[PDB]
Amino acid sequence: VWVVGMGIVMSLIVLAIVFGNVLVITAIAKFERLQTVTNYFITSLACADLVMGLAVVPFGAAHILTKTWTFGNFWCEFWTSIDVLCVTASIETLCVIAVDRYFAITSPFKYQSLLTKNKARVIILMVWIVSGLTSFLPIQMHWYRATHQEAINCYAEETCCDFFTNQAYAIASSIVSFYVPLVIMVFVYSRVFQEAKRQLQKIDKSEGRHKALKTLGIIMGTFTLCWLPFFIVNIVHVIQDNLIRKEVYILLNWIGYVNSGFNPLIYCRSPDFRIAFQELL
Numbered sequence: 084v085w086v087v088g089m090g091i092v093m094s095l096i097v098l099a100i101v102f103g104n105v106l107v108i109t110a111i112a113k114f115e116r117l118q119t120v121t122n123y124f125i126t127s128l129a130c131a132d133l134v135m136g137l138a139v140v141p142f143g144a145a146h147i148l149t150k151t152w153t154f155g156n157f158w159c160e161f162w163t164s165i166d167v168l169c170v171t172a173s174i175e176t177l178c179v180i181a182v183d184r185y186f187a188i189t190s191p192f193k194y195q196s197l198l199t200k201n202k203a204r205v206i207i208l209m210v211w212i213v214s215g216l217t218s219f220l221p222i223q224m225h226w227y228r229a230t231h232q233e234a235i236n237c238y239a240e241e242t243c244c245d246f247f248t249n250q251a252y253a254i255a256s257s258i259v260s261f262y263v264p265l266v267i268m269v270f271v272y273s274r275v276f277q278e279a280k281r282q283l284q285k286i287d288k289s290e291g292r293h294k295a296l297k298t299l300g301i302i303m304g305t306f307t308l309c310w311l312p313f314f315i316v317n318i319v320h321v322i323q324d325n326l327i328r329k330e331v332y333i334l335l336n337w338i339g340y341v342n343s344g345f346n347p348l349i350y351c352r353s354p355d356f357r358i359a360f361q362e363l364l
C-alpha cells in the first residue's frame with residue numbers, strides 16, 4: 084500500500100543528478116570565460132557523475148523494487164564493473180582537485196610552471212586508467228569470485244544478482260579507492276588551513292585600527308559523511324560474516340551514491356558560474 088507509489092523518491096535522485104551535471108558541462112563547454120586549467124578536473128568529475136546518473140542508479144532501482152534481475156548475467160557483470168569504475172574515478176578526481184589547490188596556495192610563484200595545458204590531459208588520462216584497471220580487469224576476468232556454497236548458488240542462477248567478494252579483493256579495492264585519497268586530502272587541507280590562519284594573523288598585525296573554517300567544514304564533512312560509513316562495513320563484513328546484514332549494506336551503498344548530486348553545489352559557486360547559469364536559462 085506504500086511500496087509501489089514511492090518510486091518518485093528514487094526518480095528525483097536520477098533527475099537531479101542528471102540535471103546538475105548537464106548544466107555544469109554545458110556552462111563549461113559553451114561559454115568562453117569558464118575554460119581554465121582547474122576546470123578540466125571539474126568536467127572530468129561531472130562526466131564521471133553523469134555516467135553514474137545514467138547507468139547504475141536506474142538499473143539498481145529496478146533490481147530493488149522488482150526484486151528480480153530480468154536481464155542476464157553478462158549485463159550484471161558489466162553493470163558492476165561500471166559501478167566500481169565510476170565510484171573510484173570520482174573519488175580520485177576529488178583527490179586530484181585537492182592536490183591542485185594545495186599547489187596553488189602553498190607555492191604562488193611556481194604554480195604556473197607545474198600545471199599547464201599539457202599536464203592536465205596526462206593526469207586525467209592516468210587517473211581514468213587507474214580507475215579502469217581497478218574495476219574491469221578483476222571483475223570481468225572473474226578473478227574476484229568467492230568460494231562458499233551460497234556464492235556458487237547465487238552465481239549459477241541467472242535471475243539472482245548479489246555481490247559476493249573475496250576478502251583480499253575487498254581489502255585491496257577499499258584501500259586503493261578510499262583511504263589513500265582520504266589521507267592525502269586531510270593532510271592537504273590541514274596545511275592550507277594553517278597557511279590561511281597565518282596570513283590572517285599577519286594582516287591583523289598591521290591593520291589594527293571563520294570563513295575558512297566554514298568552507299573546510301562543508302568540503303570535508305559532505306564527503307566523509309556521505310562515503311566513510313560504507314567502506315567501514317565493506318571491510319568489516321568480510322572479516323566476520325555474522326555481523327552485518329545485507330539490507331544495511333545496501334542502504335549505506337545507496338547513501339554513498341547521493342554524494343554525486345551534491346558535487347555541483349559544493350564545487351560550482353563562483354560568480355562567473357552564476358552568470359553563466361543565468362545566461363543559459
Ligand SMILES: CN[C@@H]1CCc2c(ccc(O)c2O)[C@H]1O
Pocket residue numbers: 166167170171246253256257260336
Ligand atoms: C554493489 N556496489 C558496489 C559493491 C562494492 C564496491 C563499490 C564501490 C567501490 C568499491 O571498491 C567496491 O568494492 C560499490 O559501489
